[PDB]
Amino acid sequence: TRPNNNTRKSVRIGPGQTFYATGDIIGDIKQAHCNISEEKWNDTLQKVGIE
């Protein structure tokens, strides 16, 4: 997940084509991350160690 509520900003760059970018960040600034269940990872790494 990326929690930040980003905004789409468009910029005309040359005749008839648009460059895109992020505008203001809405809300509070937060950290992107990914979660894993601990015991499932322990079980996976233990079963992989068995082999």
Place this chain on the structure above:
Amino acid sequence: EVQLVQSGAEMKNPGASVKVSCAASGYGFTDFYIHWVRLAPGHGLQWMGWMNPKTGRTNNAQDFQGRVTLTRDTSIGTAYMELRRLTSDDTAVYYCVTGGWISPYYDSSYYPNFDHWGQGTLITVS
């Protein structure tokens, strides 16, 4: 138990600016959002803005886009709101609140969990 004991009431006339400070005790200061809400004398209730006491990031009601700027001093445990360009319509009994807990992983700022409040100050723009 928990309290967010505000300052005393102080007033200036319309066109000037004023101040209110928002203390906290005994719980830690840097861990919950601090919210400011307004309750006008012959009206319902309003919202000023939310304060992130850790980083200082803030957002405010678009009615008060430039009129209000929020700040804090974590060592003291106090937060400041200063309302400018005053009018008689900016009379209220001003309240200060601890909002929700602060996580690094998701935005709890806009949660209206106005749990514990300040003891109130009667700012009649006189």
Place this chain on the structure above:
Amino acid sequence: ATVKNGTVEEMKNCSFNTTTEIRDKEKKEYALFYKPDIVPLSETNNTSEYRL
């Protein structure tokens, strides 16, 4: 922009002159960019001039 104590995950707010659809005319516009895609430009010391 800067934040101290704890941690901060911010990105830069960088402006740049753009050639609008009229080749004669240019306008100031801005965009937010993550740090990895932004590098300082000059080999000489300058704290504000950056490059993609």
Place this chain on the structure above:
Amino acid sequence: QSALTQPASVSGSPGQSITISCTGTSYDVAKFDLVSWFQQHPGKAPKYMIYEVNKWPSGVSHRFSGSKSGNTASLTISGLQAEDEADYYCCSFGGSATVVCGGGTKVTVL
């Protein structure tokens, strides 16, 4: 439209059914189930009665209750008492990382 819409004042005798409703737009109460209600007596705090549409925090008597239906969230009422004679405000999620409050209320238990 000053903030969320609310009745100006509501009333009812003990044993009678009441709902003090609060209504917002699609940029509002519809999305996140973020609404709460307050209990303000004169010269006191707006005591904290309902949050997350239905839940009641500790210190609340479980007569009080709430609900959501799309664009509105209704304060659900039972067993009226002289303490229930009070304001009943309303504040919710408003878009662009804000909240938006309600016009208030006054109950008069009959």
